[PDB]
Amino acid sequence: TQKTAEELQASEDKVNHLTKVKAKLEQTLDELEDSLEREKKLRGDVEK
């Protein structure tokens, strides 16, 4: 009873862990994405 009650709690915290990793990483997706778009526009202007 106890050891399967452990892996029940050993899942939910890791669920709670990686969600904070995922929610951080979607924000990390942002500051690359606008900066890549920034570069793309700058390059386009120079080429023009």
Distance CA 48, CA 35 (A): 20
Question: Which positions from 6 to 45 touch a copy of itself by CB under 8 A, shown as an x/- string?
Answer: -xx--xx-xx--xx-xx--xx-xx--xx-xx--xx-xx--
Residue 36: CB minimum distance to a copy of itself, A? 6
Rounded CA-CA distance 25/9 in Å is: 24
# chain residues binding a copy of itself, by CB under 8 A: 27
Report the nearest approach of a copy of itself to the CB of residue 38 (Å). 10
Nearest-5° angle of CA 8, CA 18, CA 6?
Answer: 15
